[PDB]
Amino acid sequence: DPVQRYKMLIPQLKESLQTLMKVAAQNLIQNTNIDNGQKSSDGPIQRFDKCLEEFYALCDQLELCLRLAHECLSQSCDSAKHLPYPQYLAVIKAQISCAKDIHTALLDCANKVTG
Amino acid sequence: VSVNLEAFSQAISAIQALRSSVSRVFDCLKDGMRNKETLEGREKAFIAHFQDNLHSVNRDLNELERLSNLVLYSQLLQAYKWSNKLQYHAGLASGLLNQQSLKRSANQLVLPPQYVDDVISRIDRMFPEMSIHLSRPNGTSAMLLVTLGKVLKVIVVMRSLFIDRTIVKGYNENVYTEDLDIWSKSNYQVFQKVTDHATTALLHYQLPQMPDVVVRSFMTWLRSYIKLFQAPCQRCGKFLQDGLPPTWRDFRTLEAFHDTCRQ
Amino acid sequence: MGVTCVSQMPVAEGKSVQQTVELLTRKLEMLGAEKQGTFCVDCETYHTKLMYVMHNSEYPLSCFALFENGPCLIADTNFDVLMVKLKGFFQSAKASKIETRGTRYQYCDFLVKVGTVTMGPSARGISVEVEYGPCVVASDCWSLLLEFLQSFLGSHTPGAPAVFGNRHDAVYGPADTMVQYMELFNKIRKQQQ
Amino acid sequence: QYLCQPLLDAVLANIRSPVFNHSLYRTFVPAMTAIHGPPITSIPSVLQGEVARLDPKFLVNLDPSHCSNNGTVHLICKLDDKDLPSVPPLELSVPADYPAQSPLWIDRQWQYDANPFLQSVHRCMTSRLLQLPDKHSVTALLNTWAQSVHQACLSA
Amino acid sequence: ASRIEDPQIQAHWSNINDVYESSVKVLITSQGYEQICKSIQLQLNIGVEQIRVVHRDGRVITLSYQEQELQDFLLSQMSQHQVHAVQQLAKVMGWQVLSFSNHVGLGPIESIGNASAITVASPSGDYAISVRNGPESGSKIMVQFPRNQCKDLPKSDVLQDNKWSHLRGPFKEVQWNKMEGRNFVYKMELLMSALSPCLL
Amino acid sequence: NTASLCRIGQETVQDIVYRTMEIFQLLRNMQLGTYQDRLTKLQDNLRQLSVLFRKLRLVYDKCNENCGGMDPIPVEQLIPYVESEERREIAEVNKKLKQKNQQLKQIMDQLRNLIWDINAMLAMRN
Amino acid sequence: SQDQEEIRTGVDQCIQKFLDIARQTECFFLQKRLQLSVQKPEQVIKEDVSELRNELQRKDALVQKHLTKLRHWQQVLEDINVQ
Amino acid sequence: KNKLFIKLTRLPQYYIVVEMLEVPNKPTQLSYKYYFMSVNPAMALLLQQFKENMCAFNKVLAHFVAMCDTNMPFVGLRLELSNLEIPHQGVQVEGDGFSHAIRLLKIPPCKGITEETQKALDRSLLDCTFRLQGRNNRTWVAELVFANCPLNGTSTREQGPSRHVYLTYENLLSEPVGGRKVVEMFLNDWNSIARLYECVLEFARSLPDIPAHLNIFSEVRVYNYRKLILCYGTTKGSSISIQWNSIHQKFHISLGTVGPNSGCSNCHNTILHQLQEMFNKTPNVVQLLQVLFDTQAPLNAINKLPTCFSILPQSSTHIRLAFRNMYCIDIYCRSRGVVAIRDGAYSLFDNSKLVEGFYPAPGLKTFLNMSWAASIPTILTHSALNILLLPSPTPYLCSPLERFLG
Amino acid sequence: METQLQSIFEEVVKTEVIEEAFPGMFMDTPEDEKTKLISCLGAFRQFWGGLSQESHEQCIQWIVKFIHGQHSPKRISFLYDCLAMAVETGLLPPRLVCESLINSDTLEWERTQLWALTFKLVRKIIGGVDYKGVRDLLKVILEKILTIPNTVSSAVVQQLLAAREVIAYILERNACLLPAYFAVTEIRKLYPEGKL
Ligand SMILES: [Zn+2]
């Protein structure tokens, strides 16, 4: 699903870049002509601003999908790294808490000795 | 798997690069040409910068397409993150601080044989290619026969949990297998040079207090002599200088060098 | 047992059989190589299938009997005496004996031997063997033998031998050197011209 | 090339238009500033260094006797060491643009003559200048002068 | 060990020997700085007719039964350990090494052993030290005082600015005799502390 | 007196960095009985480290407040360039230690000879 | 307090600063030692006296331990060798 | 025919030839002649006699061998310096007798650097002494000594106007000691030093006129001529580092936390890429200090959210937050301590929903925390942002904002 | 043939590479100026006596472009001493040397040491030219002096003034290198009436 979505958006991102480049070229040519001798048709034109925001929207959607997948994969690998299941989670949280007590003790002592 | 994690992390940067590169193309165009002191120079500078910006957008888009192919409860995650952080931080700190030690003097052995046996067994557990045979023919001083593939047969002479003498021999050669041939030569010049380099490594790997990491590093450096007669010299490129294979491996850098070609 | 390679080097041009060895051996001496004695390899044949018995001088007491693809027996010299005693019972063949006699040159742990398979009374050809006593492992010590050969042999350097055959951690054997010698000998006997 | 080309074509059309920026500016100002938001929140030095980094044997100074403070620098330096102080001036004319036109020593044979040691030092130092590589430096001339004096001390 | 006392000497004979072989472990440290001054160590192999030396830098030397050869070799090794001591001390006191040559070729042609060479700079810029020890002529140390500090250097009119008056200049020599401490390393750190920033 | 207090201050500042290095190594080896031992070791290290701070501070105060009469000469004016009963006690102690060192050298020579003779015999017996 | 590059550069900076200031305090101590040795050549002599006496005491203790071990092994060997 | 060929292993292709000759008057003595040979089927190139001023050491032989081994590596470096049009003095004996050094006079000025900065650099480079050290004699060190340092640091670097930087180069085992890569890397480091001197000169010129908040907010700490470590924060805890990577030809900033009061990170690691690009487009450090001072306060609040909430880093001062995937919100930081929040998924143009969609219904919650009218922004104080984002118990310790979206 | 002269003159003034490492330890005084000049003059005499008349001048153009291609002024003055003794001994006709020296386009006034040494050598060797050659040399020297600006640097003025002594030597009436009417005819052809 996260890999699948990344695949789905990539063709769209290429399409959005193509339109944004083409629309920019049409707008610049019309603006130069208006200034220049050439008088160009009013036409549909299509606004450059709308395309540039669309490209940014697709970029955010892709980054959000990848960031979630990376966070989910990192959490899974860490979970694997660390008889009944309730006692299992109990001893894990107990180890986690005793490490935190050691942390707090070292911190408070090293901060009370000086500074 | 870890390879998937890296591909996702690389991809996240590639999306950020594509967005930044597209913004750069438009942002630079808005500023437009600059005076540049010359007509030719100003035209060239604008074209060169625009083309570099346009190419960067293409390169960044291509990477994203290629990267697609490759790929009470919160406190627990907080503890996991802090454990990883402390591990990395303390590792880096210990490395940086033991690399540069300000200790200048000491003034301001007896060891259990079973402890040495346990250390040797732990070292033999790793490095599956190497096989170490413990034996005590003469006193508590241990003598280790270390077989490295069909390549080497090293004779380490422990006096304690300490390395004192090493004489490597060939695989086809006879260590006499019995009362151990401590005093002999390999009859081949290459293995004699390897004995010299092993004594040099012993004199190099000398930790003051801890007697285990020294043996660990010695065994790791010996294990590098498994690509002998196979990996050429990293200075001259050939296999043979005066009919010798490269018999030297840099400490801190397990590479290959003829001893005439130094470190 | 140290990895070895044997190849035949053609005399070329109008260089006489002996003239070429004289030159090749001087080229080996020009490697800083020092002579370490003399080597004689004398082989006899039997038309039984086909039997081969060869004995390198490097090995003082062994006599090797090789049965083509079949196993090689490394036996003591009394083996030749048993062979002679059987002789009336045994087949004999007709003057197929082949010998290569040449100087041995040592270059820092590599022994190079260049010799002229003199057939019977008339020399024809040349056999080069480079052996590495330190290299117990074989089939991947090929890079070494190849580099050393390109150093002195240059052209006509062999692209390995099949005695290495299938990639394996199997140690090189005195039997393997003898099989190389047997293929080389079959080629001199039949190269003709 | 791919996917960008018309933009490239467009700007390659419209260079050398004087109004050019206006047009770019107009069509690219609002969207960007809407999306990203508001905008942003005497003597050359090489000779001086060469002098500062000499060996304390030499005591180089300027030359106000002939050309002074003009550009190329004439120098009478010295020889002060355990060696010999024969003819300390060795007038050296370092031309402008120092990393070229290697400086030339203005010869003065009037003082180096009427004395065997001085004739020998002159001969050997001249030969040493002949063997010196092209584009030599001032330190090179000073060192070859010193070593030529030393050769005259030992060879004689 | 009895005659030469300045740097150090040590020997740890092996436990098991043979009838045609033996081995020692020679170390040349300093009197006070044992930790940092651990750059030169030897492992002699006393054969039936030859003594084989394996240095820590990967150098194997076959000596003779002639005592003079071994004595000269050990003297040269002590001379080299003397400069290695200064190097390891500069590494610890944070002094920046400017140059280090194990076998220098500039100077007087020396005895049995080739001379050594080191030059370090003070952490706070201006000051710097240089050391040249050899088997025959050794302990030639000279400090590099900064300019505008000696007040005896002849000034020049070409120097018209005060920025050039900060470079390390007159190269004054120091007498290693009539000094404090009891070891080359003791005297070297006392000299380093003397050329340190006065935090008293 | 003061010259020895200065050496004490030197050894304290040379040892505090080693103590911090040992503390770093202990925090590194602490991966998640043995936890109690690691904790009490870290606490003892911290206490001894604070004691070392106090010692170096007090010796600093001592050497700073001492400032004996003989210090008018600033640094760099002391390095020598080119251009009673205490000595008798020193000589007596030197002669004593020389005699003791000669005796200890004789003892070491005898021990080395003994070890070499035992090793040679036990090697040739085989 | 209450990825890899951050901790990397942080430990670099703090460790290098700690090393520099430690080497500076060592330099200050060495300067004080040099001054006290050059201008008060009597406390250093007392230090040498104390060090030599401590060395002599350590040597005496070592030789005593060696003599005890030697007497033990002498008795052990005298016990054996018998028939 | 009685000669010895002593090859130099460190510097190859150089061979000393020591020939022995019989002396006529003494039938029990020998004479030695030393020649310097060189090789390119070995082909000799040039040959030159060199024979001018216990008995088995032959002192002059070892002396000549050591002299050759020490001097010959400098010849290749001199040739390489001459081949790249770098004016350099010849190999000179240093003042401490024994040595060799190649003191450069002028460097090739630069590429891509303004003329006035080139002048400021060329008038500050006092010496560029190169020296050789290291085992096997293949390490080079160049000591550059600059004068008139623009700005000092908190460390003990406020001494006399002479800053000494040591640049070390160790070529590979092959590619002999005298080669092109050493001087190439040296020129690359010089170019990076110049491109950094640009920014340090700009900052030194802008130091007298400061908006008077960044002066107390930020402080310079070290200046090693290849790195700029500025430190900012209320307690001077956070640190930013400026450096020019010649491999990528772009400025590389590295952020860290050095100070005994801070969070778990520099708190700016979520905007590192946009800050990289920002400094790459316009190399000005005062703008960096300003944007950091403006964006630190909202970042301290937006970093403590539970990680549900996802932080999408958009362009600078435009950090995006998204509860789950359905909801979104835009953070527009501005000067004078104000943040404008938006509806998120809403579009700044024709009223259509984005790919995420799911228009956030309430909207007016942001108004009380002071139809489609969530799309227009709503400014705050950074203190109302602290209240809106720091987890308070409920009027489990959740935020106000996540209670709203929940 | 120009390859032959190339090998000759390049082998004259080669520089030693391996010197300045182990300085002055090589057992050999490099040929001082006199022996080097005699050897150079001998080798060039071999090539010159071998050479044909029609080929007499293109080699001289190569010699002067090789001298003007140099950079060290000691090298230039050594080869100019070689050319001076090659003219003085009678080997070279003393008109081709002067013409190819001045008409060489590398001789510009910015090469001030080359300017000074060149016009010093022409002052040495101009006394043997016949008078028509002295007239053409006068014309080309005046046209060379005419390219200097109105203002030049204050250090280069004395080395620039070396052409003035050649001009003063030609227009000197007691030396009588040429009839003075020819001199004023060339001058008034170059500075007509009304021109300073
Ligand atoms: Zn090699």
Curated annotation (Swiss-Prot), chain B:
GO cellular component: core mediator complex; cytosol; mediator complex; nucleolus; nucleoplasm; nucleus; transcription regulator complex; ubiquitin ligase complex
Residue numbers of N6-methyllysine PTMs: 103
Effect of residue 232 to L: In NEDSCAC; uncertain significance
Keyword Phosphoprotein: yes
Outcome of swapping residue 194 to A: In NEDSCAC; uncertain significance
Record disease entry: Neurodevelopmental disorder with spasticity, cataracts, and cerebellar hypoplasia: An autosomal recessive disorder characterized by global developmental delay, impaired intellectual development, and poor or absent speech. More severely affected individuals do not achieve independent ambulation, whereas others develop some speech and can walk, or show regression later in childhood. Additional features include axial hypotonia, peripheral spasticity, dystonia, cataracts, and seizures. Brain imaging usually shows cerebellar hypoplasia, thin corpus callosum, cerebral atrophy, and hypomyelination.
Identification of the protein by name: Mediator of RNA polymerase II transcription subunit 27
Organism, scientific name: Homo sapiens (Human)
Gene encoding the protein: MED27
UniProtKB/Swiss-Prot annotation, chain E:
Subcellular location: Nucleus
Tissue and organ distribution: Ubiquitous.
Quaternary organization: Interacts with GATA1 and PPARG. Component of the Mediator complex, which is composed of MED1, MED4, MED6, MED7, MED8, MED9, MED10, MED11, MED12, MED13, MED13L, MED14, MED15, MED16, MED17, MED18, MED19, MED20, MED21, MED22, MED23, MED24, MED25, MED26, MED27, MED29, MED30, MED31, CCNC, CDK8 and CDC2L6/CDK11. The MED12, MED13, CCNC and CDK8 subunits form a distinct module termed the CDK8 module. Mediator containing the CDK8 module is less active than Mediator lacking this module in supporting transcriptional activation.
Disease entry from the Swiss-Prot or TrEMBL record: Microcephaly, postnatal progressive, with seizures and brain atrophy: A disorder characterized by postnatal progressive microcephaly and severe developmental retardation associated with cerebral and cerebellar atrophy. Infants manifest swallowing difficulties leading to failure to thrive, jitteriness, poor visual fixation, truncal arching, seizures. There is no acquisition of developmental milestones and patients suffer from marked spasticity and profound retardation. Progressive microcephaly becomes evident few months after birth.
Family statement: Belongs to the Mediator complex subunit 17 family.
Designated name of the protein: Mediator of RNA polymerase II transcription subunit 17
Organism: Homo sapiens
Gene name, Swiss-Prot/TrEMBL: MED17
From Swiss-Prot, chain G:
Protein's name according to its UniProt entry: Mediator of RNA polymerase II transcription subunit 28
Lineage, broadest ranks: Eukaryota, Metazoa, Chordata, Craniata, Vertebrata
UniProt subcellular location: Nucleus; Cytoplasm; Membrane
Family statement drawn from the similarity comment of this UniProt entry: Belongs to the Mediator complex subunit 28 family.
Taxonomic superkingdom: Eukaryota
Organism the protein comes from: Homo sapiens
Record's function text: Component of the Mediator complex, a coactivator involved in the regulated transcription of nearly all RNA polymerase II-dependent genes. Mediator functions as a bridge to convey information from gene-specific regulatory proteins to the basal RNA polymerase II transcription machinery. Mediator is recruited to promoters by direct interactions with regulatory proteins and serves as a scaffold for the assembly of a functional preinitiation complex with RNA polymerase II and the general transcription factors.
Whole-protein residues included: 61 to 149 of 178
Coiled-coil residue spans: 43-79
Recorded name of the encoding gene: MED28
Quaternary assembly: Component of the Mediator complex, which is composed of MED1, MED4, MED6, MED7, MED8, MED9, MED10, MED11, MED12, MED13, MED13L, MED14, MED15, MED16, MED17, MED18, MED19, MED20, MED21, MED22, MED23, MED24, MED25, MED26, MED27, MED29, MED30, MED31, CCNC, CDK8 and CDC2L6/CDK11. The MED12, MED13, CCNC and CDK8 subunits form a distinct module termed the CDK8 module. Mediator containing the CDK8 module is less active than Mediator lacking this module in supporting transcriptional activation.
Curated annotation (Swiss-Prot), chain H:
Motif extent (LXXLL motif 2): 385-389
Biological processes annotated in GO: positive regulation of DNA-templated transcription; positive regulation of transcription by RNA polymerase II; positive regulation of transcription elongation by RNA polymerase II; positive regulation of transcription initiation by RNA polymerase II; regulation of transcription by RNA polymerase II; RNA polymerase II preinitiation complex assembly; somatic stem cell population maintenance
Expression by tissue: Ubiquitous.
Cellular location(s): Nucleus
GO molecular function: nuclear vitamin D receptor binding; transcription coactivator activity; transcription coregulator activity
Any one Gene Ontology cellular component term annotated for this protein: membrane
Location (main, coarse): nucleus
Source domain of life: Eukaryota
Region annotated Interaction with SREBF1, chain positions: 1-244
Annotated keywords: Activator, Nucleus, Phosphoprotein, Repeat, Transcription, Transcription regulation
Function: Component of the Mediator complex, a coactivator involved in the regulated transcription of nearly all RNA polymerase II-dependent genes. Mediator functions as a bridge to convey information from gene-specific regulatory proteins to the basal RNA polymerase II transcription machinery. Mediator is recruited to promoters by direct interactions with regulatory proteins and serves as a scaffold for the assembly of a functional preinitiation complex with RNA polymerase II and the general transcription factors.
Entry similarity comment: Belongs to the Mediator complex subunit 14 family.
Protein name: Mediator of RNA polymerase II transcription subunit 14
